Structure formats: structure tokens, C-alpha cells
RNA sequence: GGCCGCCCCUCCCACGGCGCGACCGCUCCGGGGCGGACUGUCCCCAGUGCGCCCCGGGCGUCGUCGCGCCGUCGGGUCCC
RNA sequence: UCUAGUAGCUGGUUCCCUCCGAAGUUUCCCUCAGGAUAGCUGGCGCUCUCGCUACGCAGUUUUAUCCGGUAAAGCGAAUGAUUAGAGGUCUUGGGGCAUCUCAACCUAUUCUCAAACUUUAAAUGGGUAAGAAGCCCGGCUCGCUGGCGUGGAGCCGGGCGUGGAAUGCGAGUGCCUAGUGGGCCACUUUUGGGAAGCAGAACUGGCGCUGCGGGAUGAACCGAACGCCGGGUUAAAGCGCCCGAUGCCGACGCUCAUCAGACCCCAGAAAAGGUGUUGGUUGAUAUAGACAGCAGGACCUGCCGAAUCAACUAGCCCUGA
RNA sequence: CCGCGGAGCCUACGCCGCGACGAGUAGGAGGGCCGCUGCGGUGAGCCUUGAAGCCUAGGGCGCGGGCCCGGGUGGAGCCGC
RNA sequence: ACCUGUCAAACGGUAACGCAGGUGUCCUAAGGCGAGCUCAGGGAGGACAGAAACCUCCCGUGGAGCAGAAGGGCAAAAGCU
RNA sequence: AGGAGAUGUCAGAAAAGUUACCACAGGGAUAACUGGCUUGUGGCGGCCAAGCGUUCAUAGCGACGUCGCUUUUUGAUCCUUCGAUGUCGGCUCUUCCUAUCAUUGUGAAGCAGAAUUUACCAAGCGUUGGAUUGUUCACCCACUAAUAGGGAACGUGAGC
RNA sequence: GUCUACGGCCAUACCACCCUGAACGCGCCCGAUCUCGUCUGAUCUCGGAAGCUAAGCAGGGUCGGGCCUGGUUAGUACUUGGAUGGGAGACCGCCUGGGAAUACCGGGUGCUGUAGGCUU
């Protein structure tokens, strides 16, 4: 699949009732997809490789977006994923700091593409949970667990180039 | 010197240009190939169908008389002219809008809408 | 090029099924074929007489002639962009009745009788077949049991 | 877009290929009748006025008598878009009202001597503008020699079609392929 | 669980160059002989399996009441005596469809939307819609919708596409 | 004239939920007495299912029948 | 002079517009640079069909019902091929010496295989059917068949329209008929060959016959197919400048190359390596005290006093070049 | 009927309306008020007050094949249907 | 000019101086019909007799044979007499 | 009318060779050069490390295997050229490549010195005179710092 | 509850071994004058009725082999259709649909038609 800024979808589905089984079990997954159409397709991708349930023999009982409970609270997220490299498949655990669960997962897709050239179709995200500051393991995330965090902004690149595009004064980047 | 040997390329495209037409079906087909001893009897059966024409006519006439009696035993009903429906507004308005059955009711309604008469 | 032999490439299509060789069961000779009924052609290698050609194996046609041991069949054959109705004589062992026609004749019967029942009962009944309609709206009860949460499993390199 | 154009133009006669001004006047008359009248008789007559001579075979007097003697055909006008020819194998001619483009002289004499009436298509329009009380007849369209040569080829098994033969005799296409004693006979 | 939809709107999104014979046949059975032509399709197992054949060539979904309204009102034409005639008066609908009870543009919209009896006649009366190019562009015509593309079944997003092509 | 606008009400229907009984079908984690087979603890032993036979419990997609109670910008040309 | 000799071979073959529009394949031929033949094309029609002040058909699906031995799988299932131990023993077996080990055979297992093997067995395939030419009653004919009022077929009357899946479409048919009968390319499948821009096949699409936007350029790629124009919008592809369009205060990272890298077909690189840098996996040490470093005894200690060590994996960059 | 009157039309091989479509080698067909030479009819045609032919920075028509007119030269025939 | 298996992509068709092979015959029976039998191989026994002579019992789904190559087919058979 | 005597090039002419004395119509539908694809073969490299090297896998080599590069070998193919692209070698002359023989600057050794071998930057400069052979190739004689290898339509015939 | 004669489907019916079999029947059984055929009345053919369920045959049994059927294998292997997906390649991932086969683990071990008996 592709990505925009992903949302979290709770998708609940089941098999169609059969004379053998009148009340088949309900199954729930949390799927991170750009839209609900992609979410339902991703649900059938996983549940078919787990529970032997195809779309033609089942139905989507429910599909709704899961809103973030504390979008104004900064959190640490652990992501458990598996991805296919050019030679082999691997299991990875990663950390991100974000305000929303979906945003952390979008960070992970960007970071997998940046560091491993992994495309979204080659990634399976199996667990995303909020981690306390004491249980974080990556130094990149741990350095922001400091109640007196304080740093300057050293060398600010002039981003408003071309606005004059021709000026007498050379830009100052100290601020 | 050497050339291509065989291909069926572009052949299916040629066939479908005028269509793969199924053979025509006729109600009567050829008796060609069926058992000659069976043909000989069927011709003899057809040859002598003229005999028993009197019995066929008498039996057919009796059936015609019997079915005529059955028709007489039944009476063709006559319906009534449809009237203005009461309940459903759409049904009532479709009746008024009918060019034939609504002609008289429309005249009365129009005569009622006249102002300063 | 390859040969024009009559039984070239019939190594498996004219072989008997596994543990089904030997004497031909006698009810195949007792099946009764009238003029006008539809038969499936399936060559049997146990009987080498009256054997249909390989291009008619798996084909379906209708009986136009009945003889002492064989049946004439009008079978459609596709030849280089035209379909022609061939007439072939096949012994009884290599044919059997086609069940598609039997199903349709049954449906005609239940249709006619349902018309008679509907007219006598003053009701209207559906007689045309319809394609599988979209599933109707319904409720799904949870029975106080939460749906089980599925999750992709970690990768493991087996032997 | 995504269509075929090889059958867009229908091939049919929309006017007579003839330059005969008298036929062109009847075409003018029956073009008006086919348009301003709901009769399908006037439409059929208009089509046959366009048609070629091979498509307007002569109608024998004997065959018209045959077709006008069928029950319910009494006191009806036989209409032929074509020529009415005389049959010498018929000895008694009843009274017939026949409309035709052409009638041979001997046919016209026999019809008139019997008490019948011959009409042209302009008098048929005046008498029956709709085509009421008519029997629309046609000559045998495949009753000419070219159709004995058409169809399945002569040298093909179950073909009874006449070959193109310069002269007829024992020495002209009778040996090999027409005889089991000379090669084969299919 | 709501009833799965009975109505689909199908837009051809591909050209006529290099189409396989089976896909070509299904497209002319759907009356999508031109790119950006659209039509309503009644959904059942017969039609759905037809739409699976032509999946890379079409973008379809479930239209809403506004979609069926704008399509019929703005560029809805009738097939009157094998001619493409604009639906300017209700008389054109009544002369061709009045025997079934469809006498106005509102009846034809109700007939298409709440698909039931006589949907075959009402829909075949409508000439295949000639939609414009999608204003704002497309994502990827050669890839399925669930992969960031254009093709296949965008179930409810078809109404966004209709706003941009109609 | 009619409908909708706020209050005791009023009937029917539809959907969902909660209980109460009756009926039916499967089941034993079951009890009691009638015949057959099984065990190297076989005479004093110990089990295993099967027929009629009625009580006890469960399930039936949450079966059928009704009875109540709760919800609906629910439906009945907005029931009376 | 016969003689303008014959040529399946090379060259040429003169005005405009409009409409339709191919083939390089089958079979036969002293046939392979050629013909005849079917196919593909055009022209002329004709027979019907629907509608306003349906005769039927289909490069499609569905619903039923048959057909098959390729992909896969199997070899403690048959035919072949084949590795290793184990438990028993008749041994026209051998060796070292009453013998005992090997070999042989048998039995239960085990490793690895098959285009010309198979119990099993797909996906995609192919055939048929989805009614008025039907269904149901009554009668007649027969020299065929026959225990029979038998059976089968034919023929004559009568009754029954809820027109018996979806979708789309107007069909049928005759004559005459030119060119062509060197092909080539691509996804997938596939034979020979180390391989080839090599040779040979299947299916579909394409080039040839075809221009247009993009791939700088290009027969075949991607997009899309074309009467002459105005407005608007897109596809594939793009938006530093050449060159239309990011002169966005675009988002997150990765990467420095003394041969950097920079977009389908496509136009150049492999095994193996790096203590370059970035992620990730597994294991281990460390308060009794980690790893460093300062030395001694000869793996232990005291002094500094918190993270460290190893193996592997995969991104960009580098060596291989 | 206090007005005595009322546009155009319909070379029917003509005129008018509506809808869809338009690539093309080899090849097929249709139309040509495209062009050349001669013949039968016809234009009470043209021409020494200037035919044919030729030249042209002139005016134009037709999608095109081509054509008409102006000007110059020329000196005896030429064209339309 | 023919035939078998494979190629060949589970209907049919499908190419190469692709692969593995066969044919220009043979049979008065090895054609036709009927009857009666069961074949290859193995185990255990019996004078000469032994790894292979002949006799007997048992097991034997065909693992034999059916003239030609191969594939299919076949057991009170299509095999033997 | 039915059998038979046969055409195996098996839809069925009645048929030996040579041409370097040759001819015509054609063919790049097709060979003999270059060039282009390919690189089996040729040539040149790399990886692993069983051994060799007194001792010692890796100074220097490198078996069993395995990955590449080049087009100065020969093949394979038939895309271009058969109404003509003059053909082997030598002679003459220029330029280019480096996979370096020497010379400049270095690193390593089983580098004591001398001599030699291995590797790096590196093609600026140089790489000869003769006997035999038509020869490319080869071989020998003799000098030398060395007597390295190649390309440019297998460079170069209106230059011989 | 069973059998016999003739069968249909051809193992859920076969194979190995053990137990039981009332009554009819089916057999084993006794014999060679006739019919018939043999080296041999063993088989085949014929005439019987002293004995016997030992055998055939039937029913049952076996943590039985096989066979049938279902789980598992497994949404695995494979595969229709798609992309200017990845990868130097070999090949691999995803979208859209279909979807197997051993080993391994359970359950079952003939149903039945026509005619005629026994179970009195």
C-alpha cells in the first residue's frame, strides 16, 4: 500500500454463517491505513493468512476510526514490526515520540523507507503500545526524558529565499 | 534460404472478425444416416396415414363438440368502468391525470377554480 | 512435425481409472437412449470398437440415430474459425446421459405445476431464476463476548 | 471510440438505377404514398420499383391463376411489380384484375378476352391508394439458370450443382472424379 | 451490518489501445466504449464477476443520492429512436418510459437510485454518460485504488471522483 | 378545513433489548429396572455400551408459540 | 530475318477528394524468390425486424452439468533412480582363525529424484443446457419391434404465455471478388544452444499500415490512436537553467565518493570485504563493582569509578573495478 | 370581408430536420460544375474595336484536382452546356 | 509417405537437421466362433537330479503373454490348449 | 463393372558429369572481410584455503571448488554491404590504450651487499641492428637501460 | 432376525487369524448302472441321502493391514489478472480473485432390487 498521514481503524469481521457453524467467532484488528477502503483490504490480508478466512466467505461487521485519547500528551511508542529486505525477513522493535498513535506509525513508515529502503507493502506492523519513560531503550528517544531540557537553535538557514531574490544585505544566521 | 515453419499467430483475430458462427438450427433435420430399415418403416407409416381419416375426423369432431360445450358452460365476465380511487393521493392524482378516465372530473375541478364568474 | 495417428496423445484420456479396470459394469449397456436426448462422449479404452475420436472426448451432443450397439450423435466441432455439426457413430460404452438436460426438464415441471397452483390459489409466485442478490442488512450479536484481537505473528526461519 | 465501421453503410437501393422517366414518375407517386400513408403495401411496392430486372422475374399467367384461385382471393387485384407473361400450357383463363408494369401482348389478349381488366400502377393508386383487396405476387427469383451453378462446389462430395461446361457430351468432364472406375466418385 | 449496496457507478479510466479480447467484450457489454464514459450497474453476482474482469480498466463505487441527481440532471441524455437526445422536457421520458410508470426526471432518478423493477429499462434508456477529465488529476491510472492508484472498487470515494468529472 | 408545534393519554405494526411461561428437536454432566457382550483383581470381581421407562440439567443462533416491560427526529395520506 | 523470341527475376507504371480496408497462416504442387486452395478484404445487393406522432445473436458473466493429467505434490504407494545406519536369519558365500566377524537375503525405518513415472491433484481451459421447435391431454398409421391393451417413430386435433438467469446488441443470406501467402517485436509459458540484437513454438497485444504527448535521441516501451478550429481539463511524464511548470518560508530521515549518485524497455558489473556511518537481532559482563589506563605476582589483585564486549544482520558510501 | 389581400419555397436527381461518427500501406468502390483531343446536337455563343499561345510583386474562387477576371505580348482562330 | 511416447503450457491444434524409437512386413492362422484352463515369479517337498530336466502342494492383481516399436487394453480375458 | 502390373521425390516428369575458357537474370532472402550481439574457446584478474615454502596456509605460490573482466585468438550467428566498402604481409607515418620491459618516486620479501622477485602512483620518454621464411607467428646471432603488450574498417594499395 | 436363485452399485464388500451358527436352505458327503469325460468318477456329467457343520458360506471379534470418509498439512505449494514494484541477476514481495497433495490424528467396515423359504 501507500501512505498519507495514517489513521487507526478498528475493523471487526467474521465468516458468513454456515449450517456447520451458525455463530462464527468475531475477530478484531487495529489497522493503520490512509482510508477505510484500504483498511478493509488490509484486514482481509492478515485474517486470511491467520484464520483461513477469505473475503468471499466472510463479511466486515464493523470498520471505524479510533480517535486518539490524549492528543495533547507527549508519549513514547514501541512498534513491533516485521519487514522484508532484499535478502530475508526480519523482526524489529523501534521507538518514537508523538502525540498520537497513528502519527507514531506514520513516523515508522517514513523511517523504514529512509533507513532500510523498505516500502509499505513489505512491512507488517504487529504491535504498537505506549511505553513509559523508564522502559524506553533507544538513546534517540531517551535524550528527551529530561525535565530541564534546554537547547539553542544554532545555525538557522534562511528559508525565505527568492522573496526579494536580489538584496543588498547578506543574511544573518545567528538569532 | 531458411524461412518460418508454422504459426497460428493472428489466426484467432481473423476468425472472430466475421464471428465463430454456430450452425443454423432448423425445426426439421435431415434423415441422412439414420437406420435404413428404420426409414423403410417410417415411409410405410406415412404412406398409409390416409386410412383411418374417417376415424380421425369423427374423434376430432367429438372433441370439438365437447370443448364447445365446455365454452358454453362458462360465461365471459364483463368488468365495470374504473372509478376514482379514494385513499392513496398518488393513485387519485394519476386517475385525474389520465386523459380518458379523468376528463369529467377535470372539467368539474376547473369549473370550481374559476374566479369572478 | 508430429504424426496424424488416430490415437496419438491418448495415453491418459483412454486409460481406465485406477483400480477400475476389468469387466465393464452391465448397467452401462442397460441405459436407454432415445432420439433427441443429450449424451456426453467419453472414450473407454477397454472397448476398442466404435471408439470416438479424441477430439470428441469431453464433448456433448444429441442422439439422432439408434442402432443395435451404437448411437449416432450430432456434435459441434470447431475447425479453424467455423463450428460445424458433425455426425459420429459411437458404441454405447463410450457415452452416458447428460445430467444438465435432466435438471432443466425437472425445472419445467415444477414451473408448470407452480403456475397451476398459483392460478388455483389466486396468488403470484416467482418463476425466473435470479442472480445472487446483495446480502441484506442484519444484526450481529456479540453475546457479551469481545471480539478476539488478531495480530501478525513474528517471522521465524524454519529448516 | 472502440467501434467498427465496416458495416455502417447499408447497401440497398434508394432509387432505381434506371433512367426510364415513366418508372421515375411511378417512383415519385409511390414515394409520396409510402410517406403519407401508414400502408405497408405502398412500402413494399416502392422497394420493388427500385429493384433490378433479375430481382423482378417475370410472372407466368399460369402461376397467377394458381395463386388467385386460393380461397378468399376472389374479387381481389393481383399486383405484380414486373412482367406478366403468357403460359401456353394453360388452356382456360378466368377473369382476373391484374396490375403490372409490363404485360406481354398475348397475355394481355388472353386476359382481356376472358373478361378481365389490366391496370397500371397509377390506376392502382387511384383505385386502391392503401392497397386494400390486393394479392402481392412475385415471380420465382431463383428460377433462372445462374442458380444451378451456385453453391457447394461440383467436385465436393454431396454437391448437385452444375459445372461450367463448354459443350455437353461423353468427353466433357465425365471421367475422373465423376466415376469410381476413374479415380473416384464423391 | 448494513445491506451491501445494490447500485454501482462505473467509469472507464483507460483507453482503447491494446485491450485483451475478454476485457474488450465485457467493456462493450457495460457500454463503456470510450474513456471517461460512465454508467450505472445493478449489483449481483453476475455483474460483480464481470466487474472483476475489467478491474484495471474501470474505477467504480457506490453512488449517493446527490451523485445520481447531478449526473442525470447535468449530462443525462436519452436513447430515443437510437438517437442521443438531451432530457429537456418530461415529455421525452414519458413517451419512451411512461408505460412502466416513469413520466418525469424525478421518476427516473428514483428508479435508478432505489433500484427495483424496471431498472433495466430506465438505465438502458440513459445514454452512457460522457464525463470530462477529472479536474485536479488522478493518482495513478495503472494501479489499484488500495495501492494508491485509481482502478477497482473505491466503495464510497466514487462520489469525490464524480464531483470532479461531472 | 387538515397537519405540525407541549401535556395525561389511545390502538396496531416494524426494529432492537430485557424477563416469564408453554411446546418441539439434540445432548448428558446425570438417577433409578428390564436383556447382551468385556476384563490375567473374572465363582465372593470389576467395568462397557444397547432397548422400554419417567424425573434432573444444558443447548438449540440464542428454535416455535404467546405474555408482559424498556428504547425509536420509527411507520399507519403523520392512528384515534 | 524468324523476333516485339521466353523470363516464377530487377526497374518503372502519369489528376483530385470521399468511404471501407488486409496478409505474411492451412492443404496440394520437381513446391521453398512461384502458383492453386481455404482464410483475411471490398463491392453489389437482397430477405426480414423494432419503434413513434423485436425475428435472433454474443471473443462476457451467472446457474447446472460433464471433460482433462499441466503447475504442485508423492516415493515408509506401482515403474525406474538413489544415501545411511538398525533388528533378525535359510546362507550351492568369503575371510581371519570350536568357530567369530563381514557380505548376501529379509523386515521396520531414513536422505535425495523423474520431459518420455505415478495413487492424488489445481488455477486458467474446452463442451452442453437455461422452453412456444416448449409442456400437457385425445386420436390415427406402420410392412419395423413384439407374450401383451408391447415398444419406437410418424401423422392429425385440443389446451396452456408469469416469454421461464444477468448484461448488451437489429439480424439473416446470395453472388462476384482484389491484395496477401518473406514477417518482425513484447509480458507470460516454452525447445535447442554457454549465450546472442541467435534459431524454433503457444496465447494475447503491438509494429508492419500510424501520426500524436512522454522515454534527450529510437519501428515495437509508457500514455493515447488522428476531419479544420476556440475555451476548459487530464493521462504517461514532469516543474534549478537550456525548457512550459514548485520563486511551497513543503515533511521525516539516509548519504561525501582523490572513478559519488541521479528513474520501466535501456544501454554496464559479480563473488568476496570495510573499526565509514546508520539502524536492527542474539548473547554476555558490571556494585560483592564494569571496559580503559597506572603496575605487580604470574589467570589474579590495588588505584580511575559507569556503561561495556562479542557475533551476526542490512541500508547508503567505499575496495573489488 | 370598413381591409379583396397575405414573404420564401418544391433544379423532388430538389429542399429541410435530428443523432452518431471521421487513422491508413497493399487493395476495393463512389463522386468530380477536375483536366486533354476529336464527333453528334445546342449556345440567333465569342473573335482583326483582337482568337490560340506565352509572361505577370494585380483582384479572387474552390478542401483539392484546377478555374475566372485585370495588365503585357501575340496576330486568327476558340470555348460553354 | 506413415506410426508410438514426449515436447505441448490438464479440450483439440501446435515448430526446429528437438529427444527416445519403429515401418515398406508377418499370419490358413497369429482370421472367426465355442469350450476348457491360468500366466511371470517364489516357497516347501520327491531315485539318479546338481544354480537350471520332470512330478506334487501352497502363495501369486497379472509383476507373464497377446509376432514386429511404444503407449493403452485385457484373467472361468484379448493370454494357453 | 470389379481385381491386378506403379510411380518410396510415396497427390504419382522418362534423365549422368565437368567448366580455372565461361555466360545471363538476379540475390545482401545467402557464404568468403570489417563492423554489431555473444564470449563457449583464447587471454587477463579476483574469492576460499588443502597443501608447498627446513620451521610457517597467505614473503612468494596455490589443489578441490567458485565469481568476474576483455574483445590483440578462434568460434557461434547472419543485422548492414553482391547495379562492387579493392584482399595477406612488409615498407612509411601519426595518434591513442595500459593489462609497466626500462627510466622518475615509493611500499614488501625467505630484502646482509650485489642481483632478483611481489605490489602502488604512473604511458612523460624509450623499446634496436641482422641470418632463414611471402609470410603474421617463430627461431637464432649481437648490441642494449629495456629490447613490454596492444588499438585506430584485424589503421594505412587514387601512399608504394 | 436370517438364507437361497438371479442381480445392481463393485473392498464401508478385500486380506490374515480367532469365536459362534437354532430352523429351512446352501454345502461338505455316499456311489458309478445309465448320460457324459478323464492317466486317475480328483475335476466334469450322472444316481443318491448313512453322516457332519471340521471346511466352504453367514454373523461377530482384532488399540489388525488395506479400503472409504473427515481433520491436519494450509490459506501453505501453485495459480487468472496488475503495476514506470524490488533486485546486477537468480528470483522475491504486494494488489485482485481461485486454491491443492504426503507424513500425522480421528470415525466407519456393505447398501440394496425381483422372486421363493426358515424363524409355526
Amino acid at each position: 500500500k501507500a501512505s498519507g498521514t495514517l489513521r487507526e481503524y478498528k475493523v471487526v469481521g467474521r465468516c458468513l454463517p454456515t449450517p456447520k457453524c451458525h455463530t462464527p467467532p468475531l475477530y478484531r484488528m487495529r489497522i493503520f491505513a490512509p482510508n477505510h477502503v484500504v483498511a478493509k483490504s488490509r484486514f482481509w490480508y492478515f485474517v486470511s493468512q491467520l484464520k483461513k478466512m477469505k473475503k468471499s466467505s466472510g463479511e466486515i461487521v464493523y470498520c471505524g476510526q479510533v480517535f486518539e485519547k490524549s492528543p495533547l500528551r507527549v508519549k513514547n511508542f514501541g512498534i513491533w514490526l516485521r519487514y522484508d529486505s532484499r535478502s530475508g525477513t526480519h523482526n524489529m522493535y523501534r521507538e518514537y515520540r508523538d502525540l498520537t498513535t497513528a502519527g507514531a506509525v506514520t513516523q515508522c513508515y517514513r523511517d523504514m523507507g529512509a533507513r532500510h529502503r523498505a516500502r509499505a507493502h513489505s512491512i507488517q506492523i504487529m504491535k504498537v503500545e505506549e511505553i513509559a519513560a523508564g522502559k524506553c531503550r533507544r538513546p534517540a528517544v531517551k535524550q528527551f526524558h529530561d525535565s530541564k531540557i534546554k537547547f539553542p537553535l544554532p545555525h538557522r538557514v534562511l528559508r525565505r529565499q527568492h522573496k526579494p531574490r536580489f538584496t543588498t544585505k547578506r543574511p544573518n544566521t545567528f538569532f | 534460404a531458411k524461412s518460418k515453419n508454422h504459426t497460428t499467430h493472428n489466426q484467432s483475430r481473423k476468425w472472430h472478425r466475421n464471428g465463430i458462427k454456430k450452425p443454423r438450427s432448423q425445426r426439421y433435420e435431415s434423415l441422412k444416416g439414420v437406420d435404413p430399415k428404420f426409414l423403410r418403416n417410417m415411409r410405410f407409416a406415412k404412406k398409409h396415414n390416409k386410412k383411418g381419416l374417417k376415424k380421425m375426423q369423427a374423434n376430432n369432431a367429438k372433441a370439438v363438440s365437447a370443448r364447445a360445450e365446455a365454452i358454453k358452460a362458462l360465461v365471459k365476465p364483463q368488468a365495470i368502468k374504473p372509478k376514482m380511487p379514494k385513499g392513496p393521493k398518488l393513485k387519485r392524482l394519476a386517475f385525474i391525470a389520465h386523459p380518458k378516465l379523468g376528463k369529467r372530473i377535470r372539467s368539474y375541478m376547473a369549473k370550481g377554480q374559476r374566479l369572478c364568474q | 512435425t508430429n504424426t496424424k495417428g488416430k490415437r496419438r496423445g491418448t495415453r491418459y484420456m483412454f486409460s481406465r481409472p485406477f483400480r477400475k479396470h476389468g469387466v465393464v459394469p452391465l448397467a452401462t449397456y442397460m441405459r436407454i437412449y432415445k432420439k433427441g436426448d443429450i449424451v456426453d462422449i467419453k472414450g473407454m479404452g477397454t472397448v476398442q470398437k466404435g471408439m470416438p475420436h479424441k477430439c470428441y472426448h469431453g464433448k456433448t451432443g444429441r442422439v439422432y440415430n439408434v442402432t443395435q450397439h451404437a448411437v449416432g450423435i450430432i456434435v459441434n466441432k470447431q475447425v479453424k474459425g467455423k463450428i460445424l455439426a458433425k455426425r459420429i457413430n459411437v458404441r454405447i460404452e463410450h457415452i452416458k446421459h447428460s445430467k444438465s438436460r435432466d435438471s432443466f426438464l425437472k425445472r419445467v415441471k415444477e414451473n408448470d405445476q407452480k403456475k397451476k397452483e398459483a392460478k388455483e390459489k389466486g396468488t403470484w409466485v416467482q418463476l425466473k431464476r435470479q442472480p445472487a442478490p446483495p446480502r441484506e442488512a442484519h444484526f450481529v450479536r456479540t453475546n457479551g463476548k469481545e471480539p478476539e484481537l488478531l495480530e501478525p505473528i513474528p517471522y521465524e526461519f524454519m529448516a | 471510440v472502440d467501434i467498427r465501421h465496416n458495416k455502417d453503410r447499408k447497401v440497398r437501393r434508394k432509387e432505381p438505377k434506371s433512367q426510364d422517366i415513366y418508372l421515375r414518375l411511378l417512383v415519385k407517386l409511390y414515394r409520396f404514398l409510402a410517406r403519407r400513408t401508414n400502408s405497408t403495401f405502398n412500402q413494399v411496392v416502392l422497394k420493388r420499383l427500385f429493384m433490378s430486372r433479375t430481382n423482378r422475374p417475370p410472372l407466368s399467367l399460369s402461376r397467377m391463376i394458381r395463386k388467385m384461385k386460393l380461397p378468399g382471393r376472389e374479387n381481389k387485384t393481383a399486383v405484380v411489380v414486373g412482367t406478366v407473361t403468357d403460359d401456353v400450357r394453360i388452356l382456360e383463363v378466368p377473369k382476373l384484375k391484374v396490375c403490372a408494369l409490363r404485360v406481354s401482348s398475348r397475355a394481355r389478349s388472353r386476359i382481356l378476352k376472358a373478361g378481365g381488366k389490366i391496370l397500371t400502377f397509377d390506376q392502382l393508386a387511384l383505385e386502391s391508394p392503401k392497397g386494400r383487396g390486393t394479392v402481392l405476387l412475385s415471380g420465382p427469383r431463383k428460377g433462372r439458370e445462374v442458380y444451378r451453378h451456385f453453391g457447394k462446389a461440383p467436385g465436393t462430395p454431396h454437391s448437385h450443382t452444375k459445372p461450367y461446361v463448354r459443350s455437353k457430351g461423353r468427353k466433357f468432364e465425365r471421367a475422373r472424379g465423376r466415376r469410381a472406375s476413374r479415380g473416384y466418385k464423391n | 451490518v448494513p445491506a451491501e449496496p445494490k447500485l454501482a457507478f462505473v467509469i472507464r479510466i483507460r483507453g482503447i489501445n491494446g485491450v485483451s479480447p475478454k476485457v474488450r467484450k465485457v467493456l462493450q457489454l457495460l457500454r463503456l466504449r470510450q474513456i471517461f464514459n460512465g454508467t450505472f450497474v445493478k449489483l449481483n453476482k453476475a455483474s460483480i464477476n464481470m466487474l472483476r474482469i475489467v478491474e484495471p480498466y474501470i474505477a467504480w463505487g457506490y453512488p449517493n443520492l446527490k451523485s445520481v441527481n447531478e449526473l442525470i440532471y447535468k449530462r443525462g441524455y436519452g436513447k430515443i429512436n437510437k438517437k442521443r437526445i438531451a432530457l429537456t422536457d418530461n415529455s421525452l421520458i414519458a413517451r419512451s418510459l411512461g408505460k412502466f410508470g416513469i413520466i418525469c426526471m424525478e421518476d427516473l432518478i428514483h428508479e435508478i437510485y432505489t433500484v427495483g423493477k424496471r431498472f433495466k429499462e430506465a438505465n438502458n434508456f440513459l445514454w452512457p454518460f460522457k464525463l470530462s477529465s477529472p479536474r485536479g488529476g488522478m493518482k495513478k491510472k495503472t494501479t489499484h485504488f488500495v495501492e494508491g492508484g485509481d482502478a477497482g472498487n473505491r466503495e464510497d470515494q466514487i462520489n469525490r471522483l464524480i464531483r470532479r468529472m461531472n
Side-chain angles (χ1 to χ4, degrees), chain B residues 29-44:
Chain B
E29 270 154 331
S30 211
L31 298 183
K32 179 247 274 171
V34 312
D35 177 354
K37 197 214 244 213
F38 176 82
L39 272 312
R40 187 176 155 140
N41 181 58
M42 197 201 339
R43 289 166 58 86
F44 286 147

Side-chain angles (χ1 to χ4, degrees), chain C residues 114-115 117-125:
Chain C
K114 274 193 288 292
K115 274 179 184 170
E117 280 189 355
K119 294 267 319 300
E120 89 176 12
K121 292 171 184 174
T123 64
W124 191 96
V125 66

